[PDB]
Design a protein around this ligand. Structure first.
Ligand SMILES: O=C(C[C@@H](Cc1ccc2ccccc2c1)n1cc(CNC(=O)c2ccc(F)cc2)nn1)NO
Ligand SMILES: [Zn+2]
Length: 958
């Protein structure tokens, strides 16, 4: 009945468990829309996906569509204030982000449910009347450059662009998508191009209503949501832009049967096998790509990976279809290489073609397709409820590909087995259509080519016909069998009825010396799933570097063993996580409760009776060595956070102390360690979900019983159960720790102002203050000053202590960033005194909403509880108490907090700074005016540093 609405979609198919309400519709201008009504959501959300990406970039301005995406946040004609959008969301419990792919640019936000319209209106202007301020463009060009700079020494990006560079140079697929200062500023200036106009023009030419999809989620009715969205988005202009397509494959025969030898930054060994294939998106209802990927990428018994692992050539394998763009795709088989595998690359690839041959001989298996269909059906029915911001964004993306009534189910539900399509794709998987890339340090100095954008050192060879012919003649290897029927597929979806004595929070229902068991029956979600969380305490886990290493190798060897067995369970919605910690071991099993007890016993039982294979020990141990070394190639700001963690923690083995001790880890020594580790334990657990109290106690009983039976485990004392402390900085102190990043040519810095031990008061001062300066900090340090792409502020919580932290990755020297952060703090001081009481109450409200936002899924709630448990604070009612206190804070309260704890001349300022110098930088100790800074005490040695200071107390439990 509305002229602006071309059609209103029918019943939108959803899971019976989904209580959200849906109406799909298509606007007169062509915008596809999905309206989502959820009366309980504390945060509303919307997203818009344009069906243009960097593949549509002008060939002379690489990264333009990406740059466009940055600029839309920087002002519209209706809301011309540069950070009006960001500031609004921040003051209303909201957030926003975006991304640019080959074919899509995706924008999304969430906000307090009370302010959907205000946010939605400002959001809409991106597509109505963007400003593209000349000043803003010249600044933000730097943020894009920074973002690229961060990727240059990253192995994943280097390889990503290299494949693009080794195909047809005239194909859009070869374009550089990110852009940098050269492509965006330097070269355009040479050519005389007005980049601001090219931005305006690109938005004008491609950001058309016929290529847009919109999703909006709020508390409002589907009716009110309809009027709101139509009111705002029917005014979007339709230029009837043809949807871009790329029918010709980027890989022609000149690019097939080619071998590439590549040199990585990190010490890694990879083999990448690629086949060009047709666009399989139209066959989505049968999805031939996923069927083949599922088998080739199978990790269970009989699989290709199983064989390659037995010969000790590979450890992990990825197989399946890989996105390209409209018109083309790829099929890939990727493995990591052992030192041995690197020598048998030709043989590995033969094995791949033998398995593929095994599939041709067997023919398509309908029961396999039928199994994938069945698993996905269950997956969609009992799908966890998504957080709004990610939901609207994801759906906005696939609205382009599917009918309105089917968007929710399209990517889950399979219709009909099409063996013809399977044979079609399988026919492309031949030696004559293969591309091979080997990534190894062993090719260093032996390369002759250099990729233009990342500087990747590589070498190109043609695969000799002698080798190609060998691969085409692939005899059936007897080691290869099709996967067996997945026996972990859940059958019992019964939701057990809430017990009479069921608690709203976890209740302590068992307290022996052996174990402490926390339990809660789910009363919010009612899906047939449960989370089993176990912390195993033992002093021998982190007593020294040698033992810390062995704790790690033990679990890694344990998982390496269970993989083939647990893989089926993972496919069937039943996963486990097993990590070594500073307190001992951490075990988490999550998923459908049905066959969950089966898996859990297998782990605990495997744990306590583990027999170590020597070959796996050698391989896994060597990988760990490279793993520790590879930390040198991490980002400067990641180093910054790592170094600070070491400085401020009572005990912390550095990655150097670890890799040194590793040389002393032997098989005999490790075999001895495991039993010693399991001989003494204390188990603390949280069982949460679709389980009864007796089933919970039964579960706990089985873990203890299995340990005692196989490992002869015994309890640990209460006094032995004290956690580590945080170093306590002196009043008016300032320490600086300086290191260099050998790989990246950006500097990193973390600045930590340590306030005080955690408590309701200190928590809310810090959080309310962080809330107030969150947006302004991003706007000043990045948007205005453009110090870096990565600019972060917020609370730091470790060992029961807390403080305010700033993190920045930049091309400027760390000492420069210091004055700028300090300059900002003085700036913020004035802004808060000038702040109106109403603006202040907005921040109190924004923080309050964020804290009280309820978990949409079980594991989110489980995390909340488990956080209170491992922190041994046990404050399960924390949010209500702290939000209550928050609302009683004064603007004067925050000013005093700042002046006492954080201000430059503050009495109780405890400041430590970590400086990470860029690769080619050098040493130096020490716009809005930056204050004078005292001379810092330069930390020369972490041990001396810790020993010379007090340690905080630990927070007492509830
Ligand atoms: O790079 C991108 C995505 C990103 C880059 C980014 C975004 C946030 C980051 C946060 C911490 C460290 C690093 C970050 C890098 N992007 C965001 C925007 C708009 N900014 C906000 O909405 C915004 C965020 C936070 C605030 F407090 C206030 C406002 N434009 N591009 N697209 O190409
Ligand atoms: Zn970006």
């Amino acid at each position: 009945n509305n002229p602006a609405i071309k059609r209103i979609g029918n019943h939108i198919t959803k899971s019976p468990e989904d209580k959200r309400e849906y109406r799909g519709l298509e606007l007169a201008n062509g915008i596809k829309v999905l309206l989502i009504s959820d009366p309980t959501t504390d945060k509303s959300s919307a997203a818009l996906d344009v069906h243009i990406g960097s593949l549509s970039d002008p060939p002379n301005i690489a990264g333009l569509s990406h740059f466009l995406q940055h600029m839309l946040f920087l002002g519209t004609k209706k809301y011309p204030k540069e950070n009006e959008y960001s500031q609004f969301l921040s003051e209303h419990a909201g957030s926003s982000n975006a991304f640019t792919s080959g074919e899509h640019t995706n924008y999304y936000f969430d906000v307090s449910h009370e302010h959907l319209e205000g946010a939605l209106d400002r959001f809409a202007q991106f597509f109505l009347s963007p400003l593209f301020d000349e000043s803003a463009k010249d600044r933000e060009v730097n943020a894009v450059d920074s973002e690229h700079e961060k990727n240059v020494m990253n192995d994943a990006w280097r390889l990503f662009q290299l494949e693009k560079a080794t195909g047809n140079p005239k194909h859009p697929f070869s374009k550089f998508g990110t852009g940098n200062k050269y492509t965006l500023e330097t070269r355009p200036n040479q050519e005389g191009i007005d980049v601001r106009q090219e931005l305006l023009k690109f938005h004008s030419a491609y950001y058309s209503s016929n290529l847009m999809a919109v999703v909006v989620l709020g508390r409002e009715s589907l009716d009110d949501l309809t009027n709101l969205v139509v009111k705002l988005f029917s005014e979007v202009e339709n230029k009837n832009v043809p949807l871009p397509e790329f029918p010709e494959h980027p890989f022609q025969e000149e690019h097939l049967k080619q071998l590439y030898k590549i040199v990585p930054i990190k010490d890694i060994r990879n083999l990448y096998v690629t086949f060009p294939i047709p666009d399989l998106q139209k066959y989505y209802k049968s999805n031939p790509g996923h069927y083949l990927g599922h088998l080739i990428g199978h990790e269970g018994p009989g699989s290709l990976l199983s064989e390659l692992k037995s010969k000790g050539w590979v450890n992990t394998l990825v197989g399946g279809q890989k996105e390209g763009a409209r018109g083309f795709m790829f099929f890939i088989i990727n493995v990591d290489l052992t030192e041995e595998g690197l020598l048998h690359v030709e043989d590995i690839i033969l094995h791949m073609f033998q398995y593929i041959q095994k599939l041709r001989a067997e023919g398509p298996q309908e029961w396999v397709f039928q199994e994938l269909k069945d698993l996905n059906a269950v997956a969609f029915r009992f799908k966890d409820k998504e957080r709004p911001r990610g939901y609207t964004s994801k759906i906005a993306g696939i609205l382009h590909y599917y009918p309105l009534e089917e968007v929710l189910t399209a990517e889950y539900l399979l219709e009909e087995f099409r063996p013809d399509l399977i044979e079609m794709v399988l026919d492309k998987l031949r030696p004559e259509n293969v591309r091979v890339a080997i990534v190894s340090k062993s090719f260093e100095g032996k390369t002759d080519r250099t990729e233009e954008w990342y500087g990747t050192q590589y070498k190109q060879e043609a695969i000799p016909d002698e080798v190609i012919k060998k691969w085409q003649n692939a005899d059936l290897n007897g080691k290869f069998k099709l996967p067996t029927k997945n026996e972990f597929i859940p059958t019992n979806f019964e939701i057990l009825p809430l017990e009479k004595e069921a608690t709203p929070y976890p209740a302590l229902i068992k307290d022996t010396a052996m174990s402490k068991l926390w339990f809660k029956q789910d009363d919010k979600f009612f899906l047939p799933k449960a989370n089993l969380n176990f912390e195993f305490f033992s002093p021998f886990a982190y007593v020294d570097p040698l033992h810390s290493n062995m704790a790690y190798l033990y679990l890694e060897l344990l998982k390496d063993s269970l993989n083939e067995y647990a893989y089926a369970a993972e496919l069937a919605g039943l996963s486990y996580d097993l990590q070594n910690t500073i307190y001992g071991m951490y075990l988490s099993v999550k998923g459908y409760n049905d066959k969950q007890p089966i898996l859990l016993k297998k782990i605990i039982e495997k744990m306590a009776t583990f027999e170590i294979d020597e070959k796996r020990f050698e391989i896994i141990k060597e990988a760990y060595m490279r793993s520790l070394n590879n930390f040198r190639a991490e980002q400067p700001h990641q180093h910054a956070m790592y170094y600070l963690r070491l400085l401020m923690t009572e005990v912390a083995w550095t990655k150097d102390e670890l890799k040194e001790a590793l040389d002393d880890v032997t098989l005999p020594r490790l075999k001895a360690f495991i039993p010693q580790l399991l001989s003494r334990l204390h188990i603390e657990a949280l069982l949460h979900g679709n389980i009864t109290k007796q089933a919970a106690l039964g579960i706990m009983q089985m873990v203890e019983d299995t340990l005692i039976e196989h490992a002869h485990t015994k309890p640990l004392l209460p006094s032995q159960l004290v956690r580590y402390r945080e170093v306590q900085l002196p009043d008016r102190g300032w320490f600086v720790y300086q290191q260099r990043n050998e790989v990246h040519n950006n500097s990193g810095i973390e600045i930590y102002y340590q306030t005080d031990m955690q408590s309701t008061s200190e928590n809310m001062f810090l959080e309310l203050f962080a809330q107030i300066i969150s947006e302004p900090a991003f706007n000043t340090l990045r948007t205005k000053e453009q110090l870096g792409y990565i600019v972060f502020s917020g609370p730091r919580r470790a060992n029961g202590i807390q403080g305010l932290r700033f993190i920045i990755q930049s091309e400027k020297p760390p000492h420069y960033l210091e004055s700028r952060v300090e300059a900002f703090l003085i700036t913020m001081e004035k802004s808060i005194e000038d702040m109106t009481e109403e603006a202040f109450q907005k921040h109190i409200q924004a923080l309050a909403i964020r804290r009280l936002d309820k978990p949409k899924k079980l594991s989110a709630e489980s995390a909340k509880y488990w956080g209170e448990i491992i922190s041994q604070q046990y404050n399960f009612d924390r949010d209500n108490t702290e939000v209550a206190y928050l609302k009683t804070l004064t603007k004067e309260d925050i000013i005093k907090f700042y002046k006492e704890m954080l201000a430059v001349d503050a009495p109780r300022r405890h400041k430590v700074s970590v400086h990470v110098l860029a690769r080619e930088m050098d040493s130096n100790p020490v716009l809005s005016q930056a204050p004078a800074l005292p001379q810092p005490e330069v930390i020369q040695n972490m041990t001396e540093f810790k020993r010379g200071l007090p340690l905080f107390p630990l927070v007492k439990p509830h």
